[PDB]
Amino acid sequence: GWWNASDIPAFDKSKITRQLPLIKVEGNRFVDEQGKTIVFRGVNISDPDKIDKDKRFSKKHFEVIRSWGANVVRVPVHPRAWKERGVKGYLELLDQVVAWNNELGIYTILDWHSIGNLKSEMFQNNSYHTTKGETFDFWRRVSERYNGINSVAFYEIFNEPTVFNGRLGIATWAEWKAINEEAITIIQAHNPKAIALVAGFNWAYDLKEAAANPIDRQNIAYVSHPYPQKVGAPYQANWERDFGFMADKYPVFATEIGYQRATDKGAHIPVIDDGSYGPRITDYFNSKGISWVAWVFDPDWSPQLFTDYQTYTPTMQGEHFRKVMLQDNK
Ligand SMILES: OC[C@H]1O[C@@H](O[C@H]2[C@H](O)[C@@H](O)[C@H](O[C@H]3[C@H](O)[C@@H](O)[C@H](O[C@H]4[C@H](O)[C@@H](O)[C@H](O)O[C@@H]4CO)O[C@@H]3CO)O[C@@H]2CO)[C@H](O)[C@@H](O)[C@@H]1O
Known part of the structure; x- marks a missing residue:
């Protein structure tokens, strides 16, 4: 696994040639360098691991994303694919998505894509299985390697917290706040411009518990x-x-x-x-x-969002989100 990983190279700086503007949080908004509000509207790709197995892992696929008007792309790193490729194999995919998004002007959200109760290690299924140690180790490696690349603006700690009505144990908002605070400290200590994205329960749906007892860190969004x-x-x-x-x-x-x-x-x-x-x-x-x-x-x-790789024809939801991204992104 992650606890075995032998001499991983550093990010290859020659893969990018530009620095996108720095994003930061100011009160309730994302703002750029000048203080202008930025609202992101984008797409999730599937796991880079799947895209590569589909033989579709090239810049072309990200160029299509850009023509749909997206100004951000979320990358759902599944703990199963991280283990199957290994740290070194997986970072080789992830560095390419980061570089491609950067050259296309698109911000990246790194998403540690598990579902369930991390504190008790109970997950919706084995595709999502990880541990606190593996999760912290992932945040540590990606915040170290992408430090200072502004397009890697967002670090989404844990895709969907859920206890599934007790089928996946017990984890109070207080305890999940403390885990997110430690992940945020690791990430900010490697990459001071990183913005962490924190979720609550009912599969990252609820924010009432967060509102009553907010993460005690800066530059955070929910x-x-x-x-x-x-x-x-x-x-x-x-x-x-x-x-x-x-x-x-x-x-x-x-x-x-x-x-x-x-x-x-x-x-x-x-x-x-x-x-x-x-x-x-x-x-x-x-x-x-x-x-x-x-x-x-x-x-x-x-x-x-689309029907097949041959055409990238939008589906009903693809057609609507594409139209709104082209129209509303500034
Ligand atoms: O990950 C590859 C796999 O992903 C599927 O897409 C998922 C996302 O990974 C995930 O972030 C998210 O999850 C769903 C979750 O799977 C559902 O079980 C859960 O359902 C809840 C519901 O939210 C409750 O309101 C209802 O009360 O209970 C049900 C369970 O009983 O809901 C969340 C979302 O809220 O988003 C995606 C679902 O689109 C791919 O679709 C799959 O084909 C890939 O293998």
Whole structure:
């Protein structure tokens, strides 16, 4: 594993030729060098490990992302792929995504893509299995190697915290705050410009517990994954109550949203919807200044943003998020 990893090279500086502007948090906003507010709207790729196995791992794929108007790309590093490639093999993919995004002008979010209760080591399935030690070691290596590369602006500590109603144990917000604080200290000690993205429970949906007892670190923003079936009923009023109101105080980065019909490929709760969710959520996010990232720019993982690699034809949700990214990104 990670505890074996022998002499990993440093990032190859010759792979990039420009420095994107520095992003930072100021009160509830992301701002640039000049103090201008920046709202990010982007896509998740699938795991670089899958893209490479698909024989699609080249700059071309990221150039398509750029033509869809995205100004950020989230990279979901699965602990299973990190173990299968090994640290050295995996960093060879990850350095290429970082370099490509950098040359295309696109910011990167590094996402440690597990689901469940890290404190008790119970995960939604083995694809996500890790440990506190492996997670800290990952944050330590990536914050060390990408230090000073401004496009690597966001470090998303742990994709979706959930206890699944006790099926995955017990972990209070207080205990999850302390774990995020240690990860943030590691990351900031390697990379002082790093912005950490922190999530709460119900699969990174809730921010009420965070609001009542916020992470004690600076330059932090908060995550929500408000998929179509997280709540029904009056949608906006429910979203505002569960996580949206947080955006009046800290920036909120909604690092997954997506939807597809009951009959679409891989359709599953909570992503099923007639289609009215797309306009409704990007309007609501515009009303709150909330950044977001659609899931997933891949033709297999569900819900898909496009139908196949031959054409990159957008699906229903792809068409809508592409139109809004082209139109609203500044
Ligand atoms: O990771 C590769 C794999 O990913 C799938 O996409 C996932 C993302 O990895 C993940 O971040 C996220 O997870 C889902 C989660 O899998 C669901 O089990 C969970 O469902 C909850 C729901 O949120 C509750 O409100 C309801 O009460 O309970 C159910 C469980 O009973 O919801 C979260 C999201 O909230 O996002 C993606 C789902 O699109 C790919 O789709 C898959 O094809 C790939 O292997």
